[PDB]
Amino acid sequence: YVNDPSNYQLLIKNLLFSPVAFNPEQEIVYANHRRHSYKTFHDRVRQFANALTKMGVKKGDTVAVMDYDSHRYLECYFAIPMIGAKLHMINVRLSPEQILYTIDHAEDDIILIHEEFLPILDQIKGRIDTVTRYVVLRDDEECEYERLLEQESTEYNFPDFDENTVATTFYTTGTTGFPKGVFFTHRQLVLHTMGILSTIGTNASQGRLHQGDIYMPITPMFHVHAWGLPYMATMLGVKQVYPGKYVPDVLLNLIEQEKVTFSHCVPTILHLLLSSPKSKAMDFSGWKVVIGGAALPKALCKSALERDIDVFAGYGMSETGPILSIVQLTPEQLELDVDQQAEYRSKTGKKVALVEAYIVDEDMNKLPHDGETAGEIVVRAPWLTPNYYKDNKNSKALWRGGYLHTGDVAHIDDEGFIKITDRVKDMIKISGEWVSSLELEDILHQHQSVSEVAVIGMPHNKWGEVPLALVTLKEDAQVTEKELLGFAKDFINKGILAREALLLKVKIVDEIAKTSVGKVDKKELRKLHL
Amino acid sequence: YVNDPSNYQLLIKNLLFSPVAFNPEQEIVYANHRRHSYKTFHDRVRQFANALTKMGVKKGDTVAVMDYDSHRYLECYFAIPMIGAKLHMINVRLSPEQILYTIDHAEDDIILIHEEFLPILDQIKGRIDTVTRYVVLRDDEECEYERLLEQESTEYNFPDFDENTVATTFYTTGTTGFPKGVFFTHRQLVLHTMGILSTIGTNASQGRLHQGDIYMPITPMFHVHAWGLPYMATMLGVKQVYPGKYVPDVLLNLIEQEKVTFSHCVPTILHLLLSSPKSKAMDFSGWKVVIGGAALPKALCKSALERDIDVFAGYGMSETGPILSIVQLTPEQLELDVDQQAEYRSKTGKKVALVEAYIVDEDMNKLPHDGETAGEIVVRAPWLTPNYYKDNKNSKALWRGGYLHTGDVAHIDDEGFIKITDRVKDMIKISGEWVSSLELEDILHQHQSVSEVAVIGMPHNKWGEVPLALVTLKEDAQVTEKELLGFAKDFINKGILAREALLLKVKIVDEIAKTSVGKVDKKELRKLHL
Amino acid sequence: STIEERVKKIIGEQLGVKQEEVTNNASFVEDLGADSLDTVELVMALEEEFDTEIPDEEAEKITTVQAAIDYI
Amino acid sequence: STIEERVKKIIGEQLGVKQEEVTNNASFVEDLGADSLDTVELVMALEEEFDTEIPDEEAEKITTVQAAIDYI
Numbered sequence A, B: 001y002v003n004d005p006s007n008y009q010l011l012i013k014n015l016l017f018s019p020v021a022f023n024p025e026q027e028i029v030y031a032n033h034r035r036h037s038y039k040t041f042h043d044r045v046r047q048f049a050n051a052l053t054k055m056g057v058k059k060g061d062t063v064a065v066m067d068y069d070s071h072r073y074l075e076c077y078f079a080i081p082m083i084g085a086k087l088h089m090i091n092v093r094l095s096p097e098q099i100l101y102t103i104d105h106a107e108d109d110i111i112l113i114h115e116e117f118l119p120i121l122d123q124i125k126g127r128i129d130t131v132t133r134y135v136v137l138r139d140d141e142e143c144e145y146e147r148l149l150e151q152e153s154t155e156y157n158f159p160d161f162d163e164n165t166v167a168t169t170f171y172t173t174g175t176t177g178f179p180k181g182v183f184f185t186h187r188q189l190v191l192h193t194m195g196i197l198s199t200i201g202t203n204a205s206q207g208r209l210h211q212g213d214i215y216m217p218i219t220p221m222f223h224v225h226a227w228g229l230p231y232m233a234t235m236l237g238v239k240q241v242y243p244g245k246y247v248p249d250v251l252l253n254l255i256e257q258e259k260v261t262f263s264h265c266v267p268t269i270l271h272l273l274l275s276s277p278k279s280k281a282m283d284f285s286g287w288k289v290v291i292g293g294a295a296l297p298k299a300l301c302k303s304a305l306e307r308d309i310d311v312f313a314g315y316g317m318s319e320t321g322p323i324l325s326i327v328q329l330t331p332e333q334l335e336l337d338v339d340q341q342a343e344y345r346s347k348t349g350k351k352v353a354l355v356e357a358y359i360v361d362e363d364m365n366k367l368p369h370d371g372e373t374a375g376e377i378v379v380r381a382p383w384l385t386p387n388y389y390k391d392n393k394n395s396k397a398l399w400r401g402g403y404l405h406t407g408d409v410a411h412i413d414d415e416g417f418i419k420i421t422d423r424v425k426d427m428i429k430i431s432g433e434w435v436s437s438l439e440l441e442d443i444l445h446q447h448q449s450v451s452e453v454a455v456i457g458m459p460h461n462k463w464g465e466v467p468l469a470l471v472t473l474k475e476d477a478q479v480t481e482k483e484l485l486g487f488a489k490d491f492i493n494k495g496i497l498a499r500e501a502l503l504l505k506v507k508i509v510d511e512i513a514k515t516s517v518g519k520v521d522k523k524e525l526r527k528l529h530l
Numbered sequence C, D: 001s002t003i004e005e006r007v008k009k010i011i012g013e014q015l016g017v018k019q020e021e022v023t024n025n026a027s028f029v030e031d032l033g034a035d036s037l038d039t040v041e042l043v044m045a046l047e048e049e050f051d052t053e054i055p056d057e058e059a060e061k062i063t064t065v066q067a068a069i070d071y072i
């Protein structure tokens, strides 16, 4: 590569070695296991570079990681991209067949696997054919990763290459036949860090990440780069705490002892932490969780606010960096009471710096932003994947019309607040009108004789597809479809036919299939029912 | 494309429209269903071209076919490549998950499927996402293929493009984690037709395919282009008979009525045809089967010769065109008796025109051709796949050292007769010597208390991997491992330790896993046992 | 006497675990080797055999099996 | 009387087919819906229950079930 020193390339090594702030005595904490400083972290990154060079990793190889949230994953987040290889993050929540498919598709060379995921590897080890070496990670001195690092020197000269070389890749298991591979370059990751820091660091007094915070992830770190937060935290040079496996009591103890101030999680983990008996007497009025998994509910937000937590929402996906939007409150909105604040903090939020977002129809006509008109969100940003790896038709459908289709339907306020309604593929098309399933699911869930509600469509001749409700009843309540129909009719504020309740045909099926991500498989339910 | 009429391109349309011989009144027969002449065939090919253009097939699209051996498959063998699209041949014997994987990998646009394979499509139809149209093929007037063709004109001007554009593709299910995609261009197929015609047409008096033959395939036509034989038969302009689904009585009736002279099949089908009670009184002394599936046995060859059949062997695989070698007998060898002729006709054969074949070691040292030294066959030919589709590491391993590795171990005679011993991955490495498993399997199968024999290896400290035998016993013969050991010791003509029988450790497992191709899964047996 | 005995039977049936180890104290999770789906389907099979009508709202707070056994 | 009755049971067990339709006349194939592997494993289960020692060499010529039933 011709360096041309006047021509600057945006690389991850510049994130590590040219940070906003560097305190060599700041700590990196692996929960109750290890502690070391940023100087030791920078030495261990160079050692890992030396070891990877020894094993024969070139500038185009792939290294796969199957680990928990730890210091080792943070070291892999840096060392592998700086060498020039791609980091493949393996989703350990997928089925072994899907994991094997992704390993075969990415063509990995070295696999770093924790010893607790060895049973998963046991049933797919024969049919791999690409991996030459396996490195077993342990939580004690028997770790092979530690043995390989403590055999190398802490000096290394990291190369300079094009900023458009691929840095990371991972596979998303959305609505498609096989997992789809997204990938990002060095420039995209550096720009994502810079943009999100400029957006959420410059906030006046609410929900800001600054140089005095203490960061601990509660997001599994193999999904979307843990929302790019480890990169931002390393750039700020703040204290970082890694919990490992997520156990509510361990997490609460870590929050108490380490004085953690900034975290990110999903609504289920937050509900578990707030409902834990150990959390009732524990101080929370310094914590700044951001909820970005999916659809932070208003009641959980209200409870968290009553526990005096700076809780706010954010939006993203695998193809988008991920961060596209964050809830930011103007300083007049912190004077509102708990209910209106909870309503404001549950929204999707406003788009972050350098992000263009519109709502369109199937003809891509850019519907108005009035707070009522709903269409699919299409975005442009400096950190979007250009296509799916080794894919053409899905890649073409992803970037239809010059914008990236997120597959989500939302209405945007006049002031810019986005409110996501539901997915594109979950739409309910009756005759010539367009309604969501999530609001109907919540309305039927408000009944006192339902546990989980699933609403899917059923084709008809005149009115087209009509909604159908699948729920599970409650104790001593053998309430048939007529009772649920009457309860739905008891409501108000609906369009279409009277109260849009003329072809509901509600049913009750005992078991609802749930994917490996915990969500219900609506396509499988459709296949089984119709 | 710039035509440059002086610059000749080798295309399949030249095979169809510039044949060796063209008789417009020669027939094409679909078994007891339809009959039409070569003129009608050429009209229907142009009609199919018109229909494919109407449906929106471009010069890079993929059309997948799930059919039996019929006139429709012969029409697809021509019309789709001439338009410029790739023909994807789907193996209907694979599991539905493998079929779905191959459909997703090849990214097909239109699927032509027979109505009897609809249950297979039923369980994978949801997770496809690439196919836009399905065409259902039937054996009556209700066929949608027939309805689409009889709505078009019989005039079409076929384009001229580069001879290196891909024409066909199919997926091989060999020893690897996922099916591997091989592909061929127009030039390779035309050259394969020319070369095999030059090799087997110029034979003096035995095993020659000429312009007076009647051809009927007994090979499923979706495997390796049916060994390129439909192309050769169309080039010769001979009468062609297609049986459809393979039923021994139907096949025998077709051979009697249509006066079939040339066929190709596998040893199992030939054994079924010879053992059928309908075949005892039927004349066979005009038939010229070529056995190329795998390892034509000497006893079946002897029985076929006693029934006065010109039966001979041939060698090939998915990556190789397929034809690499054919058994050709010099005119002094037709005076030998039935036993020596059977021995000669069971061999792999000599390499065909324009084929270079050597046997090498793991260091690629080109072992001598003495009839005893055994190594892996590596070939060069004008019709080999250059790599696997969307694959790098397996592609690199396929063309190691500048030759294509077939994965077969053989010894070559001084006069050129090749004798395949067994596969590379089935090798038995004891200490520092190299022995096969197939001869041990046959020796143990000669016992009077065995049905099927499987011989696989078992690692040891000093002698390395040692052989192990898995068999199923016979009636009222509870013969333990000691009896089988003694029977093996009762033999002679073996090297290594005495008679290479010191660590056999023969066992008896009831059920032997068998792949979708009818062969035993040795890797799965190893996984279950060790 | 007999009711509590057969609740140790149900959760042991689908997960292939013997009745001596599987008791009132043995929870819905860990020792049985059940995931989220396995646990909810065991909770359902409880009512598919003893004819209760579990809403999963009592299951949000029971994590010892014993709670359900006595709940019956 | 009783031996022939229970041979109609075995081949009906694994393939989930009732004993009235599945009889001596009903072959190892077609009406049962068995593949090559299903047929050979039914032939094996015949000896795993009635304690014969089938070599598959008698199975190369039996294609009616009745042949095996009487063979016993």
Ligand SMILES: Nc1ncnc2c1ncn2[C@@H]1O[C@H](COP(=O)(O)O)[C@@H](O)[C@H]1O
Pocket (backbone or CB within 6 Å): A172, A173, A174, A291, A292, A293, A294, A295, A296, A313, A314, A315, A316, A317, A318, A319, A348, A406, A407, A408, A420
């Ligand atoms: N703050 C949010 N509110 C609602 N849905 C969200 C939010 N964040 C993420 N999602 C959803 O999670 C999905 C991410 O899918 P994936 O590609 O698997 O990461 C998005 O498409 C959104 O539909």
Ligand SMILES: Nc1ncnc2c1ncn2[C@@H]1O[C@H](COP(=O)(O)O)[C@@H](O)[C@H]1O
Pocket (backbone or CB within 6 Å): B172, B173, B174, B291, B292, B293, B294, B295, B296, B313, B314, B315, B316, B317, B318, B319, B348, B406, B407, B408, B420
């Ligand atoms: N005439 C033959 N004798 C022995 N083995 C054969 C013969 N023809 C083909 N084979 C085997 O069949 C295999 C073809 O594998 P495939 O790629 O699935 O078509 C070859 O690799 C050979 O090992």
Ligand SMILES: *C(=O)CCCCCCC/C=C\CCCCCCCC
Pocket (backbone or CB within 6 Å): A196, A200, A219, A220, A221, A223, A224, A227, A264, A266, A290, A291, A292, A293, A294, A313, A314, A315, A316, A317, A318, A322, A323, A324, A325, A326
């Ligand atoms: C489970 O880890 C969820 C991963 C799948 C869905 C992606 C979630 C969206 C990603 C980020 C949300 C935006 C919030 C970013 C927080 C930035 C600091 C304020």
Ligand SMILES: *C(=O)CCCCCCC/C=C\CCCCCCCC
Pocket (backbone or CB within 6 Å): B196, B200, B219, B220, B221, B223, B224, B227, B264, B266, B290, B291, B292, B293, B294, B313, B314, B315, B316, B317, B318, B322, B323, B324, B325, B326
């Ligand atoms: C089942 O159809 C077998 C397909 C898989 C293995 C490929 C078989 C090898 C192909 C051809 C053998 C060579 C004989 C060619 C005959 C030419 C006329 C003499």
